[PDB]
Amino acid sequence: PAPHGGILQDLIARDALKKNELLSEAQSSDILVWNLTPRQLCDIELILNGGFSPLTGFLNENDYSSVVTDSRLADGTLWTIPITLDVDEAFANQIKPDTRIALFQDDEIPIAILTVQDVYKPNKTIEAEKVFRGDPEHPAISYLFNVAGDYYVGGSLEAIQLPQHYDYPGLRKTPAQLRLEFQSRQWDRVVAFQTRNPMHRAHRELTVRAAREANAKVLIHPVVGLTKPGDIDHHTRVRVYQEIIKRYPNGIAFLSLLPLAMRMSGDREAVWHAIIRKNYGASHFIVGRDHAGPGKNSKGVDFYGPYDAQELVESYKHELDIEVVPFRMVTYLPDEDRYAPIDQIDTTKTRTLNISGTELRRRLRVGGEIPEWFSYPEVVKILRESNPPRPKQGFSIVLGNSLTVSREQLSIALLSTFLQFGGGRYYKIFEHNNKTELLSLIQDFIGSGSGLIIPNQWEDDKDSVVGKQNVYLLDTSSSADIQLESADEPISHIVQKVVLFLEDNGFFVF
Amino acid sequence: PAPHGGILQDLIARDALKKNELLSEAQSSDILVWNLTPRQLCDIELILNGGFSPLTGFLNENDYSSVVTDSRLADGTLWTIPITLDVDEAFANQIKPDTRIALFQDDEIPIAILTVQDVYKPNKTIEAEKVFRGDPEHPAISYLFNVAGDYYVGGSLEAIQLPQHYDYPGLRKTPAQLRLEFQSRQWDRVVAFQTRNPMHRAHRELTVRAAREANAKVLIHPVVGLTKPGDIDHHTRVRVYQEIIKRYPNGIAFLSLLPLAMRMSGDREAVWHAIIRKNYGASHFIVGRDHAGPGKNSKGVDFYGPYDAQELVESYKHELDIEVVPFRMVTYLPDEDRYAPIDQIDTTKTRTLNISGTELRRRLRVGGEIPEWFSYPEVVKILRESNPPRPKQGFSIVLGNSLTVSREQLSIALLSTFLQFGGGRYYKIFEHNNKTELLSLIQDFIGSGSGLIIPNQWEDDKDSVVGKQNVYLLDTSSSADIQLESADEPISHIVQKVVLFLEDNGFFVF
Ligand SMILES: Nc1ncnc2c1ncn2[C@@H]1O[C@H](COP(=O)(O)OP(=O)(O)O)[C@@H](O)[C@H]1O
Ligand SMILES: Nc1ncnc2c1ncn2[C@@H]1O[C@H](COP(=O)(O)OP(=O)(O)O)[C@@H](O)[C@H]1O
Ligand SMILES: [Ca+2]
Ligand SMILES: [Ca+2]
Ligand SMILES: [Ca+2]
Ligand SMILES: [Ca+2]
Ligand SMILES: [Ca+2]
Ligand SMILES: [Ca+2]
Ligand SMILES: [Mg+2]
Ligand SMILES: [Mg+2]
Ligand SMILES: [Mg+2]
Ligand SMILES: [Mg+2]
Ligand code: NA
Ligand code: NA
Ligand code: NA
Ligand code: NA
Ligand code: NA
Ligand code: NA
Ligand code: NA
Ligand code: NA
Ligand code: NA
Ligand code: NA
Ligand code: NA
Ligand code: NA
């Protein structure tokens, strides 16, 4: 179908003969410069290549406001997610309309020149409530208040080049490129599948049903920009994707990576995804259970209904101009050894089985087996590879402040003890001396699979610098992970407590 | 580099706005029509897409002649293999210069409109001797005299569409497309690897050395048009290729199928391959041992020297305008467990190992093991899949004419006997009654893995219709595959002879 708004806004193509000129300007000693943030680099690349058509810059207050209260651009164009350039008060204060800002990447690569139309200070609470449903634990809300700048700069863009990427070089097809791909193959019907997690049996089956129902070819269009904190990294996923694509019949599917920065905005996000996929050349778009939803909040309540997205997309049906292929919870049927939409089976006279993400995360962490029927073995292998079981995980033991025994001697004792176990883990007594340049390495080591013995705590002001994962506190404090009986407890006693704790948590296996 | 001649002759692009017009003409009740042969469909697709640049139609006598005696087109452009439209006397007699012929595919799809320049009757002997070196067993020479028409029709072409293909739809990149592929990835150095056989360890290693030596990305450009009779089918090969490509480091290689019709013209063919690859956008081209050679003739003598191609290519070096990466026999080194060019090892103080094609063909036919070091297991699996060991092969037993026992009873006896063995083969008493519509099916069954019991021989005039593979003759004749003692030999005796014969040839395994 035609790109949203009718015109593919490929600004790279549009501004081709301005490149050298824009480049010079971007590099002049007088232009205002802003180094794009990660999500901003994700958004600007979708703007510059026509993925966010009709958009051609970041939303101004008028357009932004309409999107928030209307799910539409000022002119009425259906648009649910606000795309804005958030900056800080400092930078904002140097901006005036008509001003031209050079937007860089990594403070080195000139991406584009923004021509300021306005500088406003959004009410983050309204955006939070109206666009993301207001739950503070919601990924987009947390980002909004904790990472996003407090001042938005609206304005038109002029392309210099798309953000640089050294991985998966040929796979990040642009709307124009993908459209050309489908064309060279004479694909006039393509159903797109959005995804931010690895694909298992259910997915393969559901995407194939879609291809069969829609009579269209399959586009696995995974998100590699930004997703939900805690998601499997995109590299591990691209591998999972390239592997699973070999399970489809020869010539039915195409893989293309989408550098989109998700918002986990359930239903609004689905409407947005459909618009994006249409721009990219898809004729059909899959919207399954809890599309783009972030699950439940700590209280166990749903951020979005399991089918809110489907319903919203359905209400915008005649406007989207792209066909939606809805799916009900696709589950496993033991007795018939096959998958199928829950709405097609009698959950009364037929038994179903389902390994949830939580459940999977768990197996991977304990080294537990994952059913042959759940996912393909190569997929699981790749997952295990980058999400190793506890006996392969790294960790850190911190000698609490309450500790009264010799920290040096307790450290050595723990070191020598861990060493005798053997098995491949690297151990080290890591003194940070409160230097953040060191504190910031604690997780690099844990991430490398190493066991670190830390002689003492770090200032509370520096706590943010350290990634809490697999970091355990040894102390008499009630809030210690490994609680000591008393600050003067004999070393050997402490060592056994720590060993058994780590063994109880899968780090050690004898 | 620039395409040969300087201009990419993508006639599909050139004649885009003529398509509807050419189409109408091609489909008029008055235009002369010729349905392209297989190799002709191979050649015309390389002409229409700029692969044979500078060519823009089939060679006329002037150009043809110069290519034969000069390895150059009339204007001097380096060109070693003659590309002509060979027709029969009947068709030829209706052609006059200025005439326009509609060239169809499968008598249904209009490919192009040829504007006749001349109609000549080539001296096949000269072409055989001068271009293919005159050995009658040479693949190109046999085709020349046994398949090629005796009259060549030279003339310019006007594109309607490239030949239709329903398999590997997106993989058959055109020069322009490939060039666009390399570009979108910013590949300014690409070394192309030609191939018509499956790729094993040696190949992967040799193409990687090339990539490293040349400082260029890898293009696996296999031939899927026409190769040498007896080669592994291209489908099996594409699978082998798609699998082996996964053994290269991420992002270093690209796979694109070339619908070229090989000539197995050793050195001349190599020069031609380099020109073709240059047109397709390559900056480097690999030329290894016996490039494009058909091996030895039945007498055991070489059609070309193991490095004739390398030497010819080298002599045209400053003309080819594409860098050649020559390789000496790449062999295996047991003790160092690695491959390397023979010219880099001391064949005196180091042992080498090599499983030749013949040797491989043999293992595959006996179900023999293929060294882990020779090829990758997935590749070998795919090969075995379409080149099954004897116990899975089909065959046919023919009751010779000399036979004097009851043909009906001997047939049944052989049928019931084979049946008791079990094992999965399908058996049938196949009566052909000399009807070619039936004789032509004999190989389809053998190909399907079935065992056919044929009650009697077929007329000699019909012999050509039958594929001699796995077709054994039971007769008293000295020239019988399973020789009987006498035409009246008792059935049970004959049955044992046949059983033991088939068991001795791997068809039966107990
Ligand atoms: N078991 C399932 N039943 C129905 N739909 C599913 C199922 N699993 C995944 N989907 C759908 O597949 C798509 C991508 O899945 P996933 O990556 O987990 O979520 P997200 O929408 O956040 O990308 C979504 O449309 C989702 O609703
Ligand atoms: N062992 C080897 N050492 C060096 N080059 C090789 C070796 N095997 C194959 N090659 C080269 O690989 C390319 C393709 O191989 P193949 O398909 O067998 O022959 P062809 O040249 O007929 O396409 C050729 O350039 C050939 O010379
Ligand atoms: Ca704030
Ligand atoms: Ca629920
Ligand atoms: Ca005490
Ligand atoms: Ca003849
Ligand atoms: Ca030889
Ligand atoms: Ca007798
Ligand atoms: Mg980028
Ligand atoms: Mg989900
Ligand atoms: Mg074709
Ligand atoms: Mg060879
Ligand atoms: Na439309
Ligand atoms: Na810098
Ligand atoms: Na709801
Ligand atoms: Na519409
Ligand atoms: Na429809
Ligand atoms: Na426990
Ligand atoms: Na040149
Ligand atoms: Na016909
Ligand atoms: Na002669
Ligand atoms: Na060079
Ligand atoms: Na020679
Ligand atoms: Na024998």
Kindly report the CATH number assigned to the domain that includes residue A16: 3.10.400.10
Judge whether B123 is annotated as a binding position: no
Contact in structure between A51 and A281 (CB atoms under 8 Å) = no
What is the Cβ-side half-sphere exposure of residue B91, based on CA atoms within 13 angstroms? 23
| Length of chain A counted residue by residue | 510
Rounded to whole angstroms, the Cα distance separating B403 from B475 reads 6
A248 touches chain B (CB under 8 A): no
Residues A221 and A105 in one domain: no
Query: Pick from A143, A170, A188: which residue ends a domain?
Result: A188
Dihedral sign for Cα A408, A410, A412, A418, please: negative
What is the Cβ-side half-sphere exposure of residue B79, based on CA atoms within 13 angstroms? 21
**Which tokens in the block code for residue B298?**
């039945």
Q: Residue A232 carries which side chain, given as an amino acid letter?
A: I
SS3 content of chain B, % helix, strand, coil (to 5): 40, 20, 45
Q: Which long-range contacts (CB under 8 A, 24 or more apart) does A383-388 make?
A: A383/A198, A383/A232, A383/A236, A383/A240, A385/A236, A386/A232, A386/A233, A386/A235, A386/A236, A387/A232, A387/A236, A387/A361, A388/A364, A388/A449
B249 touches chain A (CB under 8 A): no
**Which tokens in the block code for residue A417?**
């003890």
Per DSSP, helices labelled H in B448-509 are 491-504
Residues A286 and A235 in one domain: yes
CA distance B336 to chain A (A): 28
What is the Cβ-side half-sphere exposure of residue A413, based on CA atoms within 13 angstroms? 18
Experimental method: X-ray
Rounded to whole angstroms, the Cα distance separating B439 from B430 reads 9
Burial code of A360-397, b = ≥16 C-beta within 10 A, e = fewer?
A: beebbeeeeebeebbbbeebbebbeeebebbbbbbbbb
What is the Cβ-side half-sphere exposure of residue B76, based on CA atoms within 13 angstroms? 1
Beta-carbon separation of A181 and B167 below 8 A: no
Rounded to whole angstroms, the Cα distance separating B46 from A89 reads 62
Active-site residues of A: which are they?
195-197
Residues B265 and B214 in one domain: yes
Q: How far is CA A306 from the centre of its chain?
A: 20
Indicate which CATH number applies to the domain containing B480.
Answer: 3.40.50.300
CB nearest A251 (choices: B169, B184, B186) = B169
Q: Which residues, at least 6 apart from A317, have a Cβ–Cβ distance to it below 8 Å? A: A324
Contacts of A177 in chain B (CB under 8 A): 184
Our count of domains for chain A comes to: 3
**Which tokens in the block code for residue B321?**
């305008």
Contact in structure between A425 and A394 (CB atoms under 8 Å) = yes
Dihedral sign for Cα B170, B172, B174, B175, please: positive
For A453, the domain range is 389-510
Dihedral sign for Cα A265, A268, A272, A274, please: positive
Rounded to whole angstroms, the Cα distance separating A238 from A382 reads 10
- Give the bridge partners for B218, in sequence order: B191, B253
Contact in structure between B499 and B420 (CB atoms under 8 Å) = no
| Given resolution (angstroms) | 3.0
Rounded to whole angstroms, the Cα distance separating A79 from A72 reads 5
Rounded to whole angstroms, the Cα distance separating B399 from B404 reads 10
Collapse the DSSP code of B144 into the 3-class scheme (helix H, G, I; strand E, B; otherwise coil) and give the result: helix
Rounded to whole angstroms, the Cα distance separating B307 from B341 reads 13
Would you tell me the crossing angle of helices A61-70 and A124-132 to the nearest 10 degrees? 40
Burial class (CB in 10 A: 0-12, 13-18, 19+), A311: middle
Rounded to whole angstroms, the Cα distance separating A134 from A145 reads 11
Rounded to whole angstroms, the Cα distance separating A325 from A323 reads 7
Would you tell me the crossing angle of helices A491-504 and A407-421 to the nearest 10 degrees? 40
Nearest CA in chain A to B235: A250
Burial class (CB in 10 A: 0-12, 13-18, 19+), A116: buried
* Bridge pairing between strands B330-333 and A151-159: unpaired
User: For tokens 């060993």, what's the residue?
Assistant: A499
**Which tokens in the block code for residue B219?**
């293009």
- Give the bridge partners for A86, in sequence order: A152
Contacts of A169 in chain B (CB under 8 A): 185-186, 251
Query: Pick from A341, A364, A388: which residue ends a domain?
Result: A388
* Bridge pairing between strands B395-399 and B86-87: unpaired
Contact in structure between B240 and B382 (CB atoms under 8 Å) = yes
| Length of chain B counted residue by residue | 510
Residues B380 and B415 in one domain: no
Judge whether B347 is annotated as a binding position: no
Rounded to whole angstroms, the Cα distance separating A247 from A253 reads 10
Rounded to whole angstroms, the Cα distance separating A59 from A84 reads 5
Collapse the DSSP code of A105 into the 3-class scheme (helix H, G, I; strand E, B; otherwise coil) and give the result: strand
Residues A496 and A404 in one domain: yes
**Which tokens in the block code for residue A413?**
């004792």
Tell me which residues have their CB closer than 6 angstroms to ligand 1. A 194-197, 202-203, 206, 286-292, 327, 329-330
Q: Residue B488 carries which side chain, given as an amino acid letter?
A: D
* Bridge pairing between strands B190-195 and B217-222: parallel
Cα B62 to Cα B67, B88, B152: the distances in Å are 9, 20, 12
Rounded to whole angstroms, the Cα distance separating A235 from A382 reads 10
Residues A372 and A406 in one domain: no
Collapse the DSSP code of B48 into the 3-class scheme (helix H, G, I; strand E, B; otherwise coil) and give the result: helix
Collapse the DSSP code of A411 into the 3-class scheme (helix H, G, I; strand E, B; otherwise coil) and give the result: helix
Collapse the DSSP code of A72 into the 3-class scheme (helix H, G, I; strand E, B; otherwise coil) and give the result: strand
Per DSSP, helices labelled H in A215-327 are 234-244, 266-279, 308-315, 317-320
**Which tokens in the block code for residue B278?**
């240059």
Q: E strands of B5-162, at which residues?
A: 32-35, 57-58, 86-87, 100-105, 109-120, 151-159
Rounded to whole angstroms, the Cα distance separating B339 from A360 reads 42
Residues B18 and B133 in one domain: yes
For residue B45, give the ligand nearest its CA.
Answer: 11
Q: Which long-range contacts (CB under 8 A, 24 or more apart) does A380-385 make?
A: A382/A198, A382/A236, A382/A239, A382/A240, A382/A243, A383/A198, A383/A232, A383/A236, A383/A240, A385/A236
Which contiguous run of DSSP H or E holds residue A183? helix A175-184
SS3 content of chain A, % helix, strand, coil (to 5): 40, 20, 45
Rounded to whole angstroms, the Cα distance separating A440 from A364 reads 26
Residues B446 and B509 in one domain: yes
**Which tokens in the block code for residue A472?**
């355990």
Judge whether B209 is annotated as a binding position: no
**Cα–ligand 16 centroid distance for A8 (angstroms):** 15
**Which tokens in the block code for residue B60?**
């006329």
Residues A153 and A247 in one domain: no
- Residue A106 gets which letter from DSSP? T
- Give the bridge partners for A49, in sequence order: A10
- Give the bridge partners for B353, in sequence order: B332
Query: Pick from A188, A208, A233: which residue ends a domain?
Result: A188
**Which tokens in the block code for residue A455?**
């002689």
Residue B457: CB atoms within 10 Å: 18
Indicate which CATH number applies to the domain containing A305.
Answer: 3.40.50.620
Contact in structure between B247 and B234 (CB atoms under 8 Å) = no
Residues A178 and A222 in one domain: no
A422 touches chain B (CB under 8 A): no
Contact in structure between A252 and A187 (CB atoms under 8 Å) = no
Residues A355 and A414 in one domain: no
**Which tokens in the block code for residue A506?**
């899968």
Residues A52 and A94 in one domain: yes
User: For tokens 């704790």, what's the residue?
Assistant: A501
User: For tokens 């020598």, what's the residue?
Assistant: A416
Nearest CA in chain B to A185: B170
